[PDB]
Design a protein around this ligand. Structure first.
Ligand SMILES: C=C1[C@@H]2CC[C@H]3[C@]4(C)C[C@H](O[C@@H]5O[C@H](CO)[C@@H](OS(=O)(=O)O)[C@H](OS(=O)(=O)O)[C@H]5OC(=O)CC(C)C)CC(C(=O)O)(C(=O)O)[C@H]4CC[C@]3(C2)[C@H]1O
Ligand SMILES: OC[C@H]1O[C@H](O[C@H]2[C@H](O)[C@@H](O)[C@H](OCCCCCC3CCCCC3)O[C@@H]2CO)[C@H](O)[C@@H](O)[C@@H]1O
Length: 279
């Protein structure tokens, strides 16, 4: 039952990190998809910034509201790690490389590997991300829970509603991984600084894809939908300008530092309270 303990405790760790990150995560998602909310009459007025969003959301909805949708984040660990344990090792065997065999080969193989594993994961898991996203962007709240989101979205758009924005998310995974490993190699506390700068750059450069993905998610249950990722992109840029793609980026970076800090702290607390850390 050792594997069970490692599994569940790892899930507790991930749950801690995601729960801590949750409040600033929602602010990012609100600022990012506020035009969609305006379209769906879920928002009364465009936000002025991060502080505005925090203040308004708090005073109007409450404090607990900041952890809305986080349950999806918590229960996401188990199917992902089940898939992670099952196939990630075997997939790496198919595409992986030691740097000595070739840097180009290592890079490309790493891209293909991470992309394929990520896609395989999303094939089972993407719906949870959809639910999280739809629950984050609210306020009579449009949705009343995970199950409500699923049932209603299935009732309106069927299965495709749950998997909307899949391709820009995959492309996003590939791009993000490429930037991450590239920057990681280029420049290699010191560890905290490196991790923060790398993560920040990689996530920032790959952000518009994420925005497209999430706003495509938002169109589920609506009469008007984007005709693919490129169509979405084109319409967003035409209507609101290029900067609109980067809406909520800074809040996401704040989620970054927050998450890194919390996960390091909790790792320390794990070494204190338990013999070994479960990550
Ligand atoms: C278009 C985008 C933007 C760029 C790509 C992704 C991630 C950043 C992509 C990121 O993708 C992660 O990248 C990591 C660094 O390479 C990689 O770690 S590593 O392989 O050990 O090196 C993770 O692989 S895993 O096996 O450990 O789990 C991988 O997560 C996945 O592939 C699982 C999928 C279910 C996502 C995961 C994730 C994260 O913020 O971390 C997450 O799902 O939480 C995404 C957020 C959403 C976007 C943002 C997606 O909307
Ligand atoms: O806040 C007002 C508007 O913000 C966004 O529009 C941005 C666009 O997204 C954005 O692409 C556009 O850019 C124009 C400014 C160009 C910046 C020049 C850079 C030079 C280098 C240093 C940084 C700035 O500015 C618009 C504002 O006039 C939103 O997309 C709009 O919906 C919103 O009405």
């Amino acid at each position: 039952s050792n594997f069970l303990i490692d599994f569940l405790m790892g899930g507790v760790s991930a749950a801690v990190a995601k729960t801590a990150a949750s409040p600033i995560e929602r602010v990012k998602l609100l600022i990012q998809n506020q035009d969609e909310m305006l379209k769906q009459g879920t928002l009364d007025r465009k936000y002025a910034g991060i502080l505005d969003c925090f203040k308004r959301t708090a005073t109007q909805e409450g404090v607990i509201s900041f952890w809305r949708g986080n349950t999806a984040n918590v229960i996401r660990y188990f199917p992902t790690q089940a898939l992670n344990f099952a196939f990630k090792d075997k997939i790496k065997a198919m595409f992986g490389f030691k740097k000595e065999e070739g840097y180009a080969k290592w890079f490309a193989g790493n891209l293909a590997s991470g992309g394929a594993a990520g896609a395989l994961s999303l094939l089972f898991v993407y719906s949870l991300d959809y639910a999280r996203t739809r629950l984050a962007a609210d306020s009579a709240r449009q949705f009343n829970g995970l199950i409500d989101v699923y049932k209603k979205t299935l009732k309106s758009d069927g299965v495709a509603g749950l998997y909307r924005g899949f391709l820009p998310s995959v492309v996003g995974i590939v791009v993000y991984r490429g930037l991450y490993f590239g920057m990681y190699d280029s420049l290699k506390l010191a560890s905290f600084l490196l991790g923060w700068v790398v993560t920040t750059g990689a996530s920032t450069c790959s952000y518009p894809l994420d925005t497209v993905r999430r706003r495509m998610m938002m169109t589920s249950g609506q009469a008007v939908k984007y005709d693919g990722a490129f169509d979405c992109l084109r319409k967003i840029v035409a209507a609101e300008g290029v900067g609109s793609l980067f809406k909520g980026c800074g809040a996401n970076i704040l989620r970054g530092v927050a998450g890194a800090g919390v996960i390091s702290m909790y790792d320390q607390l794990q070494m204190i309270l338990f013999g070994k850390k479960f990550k």
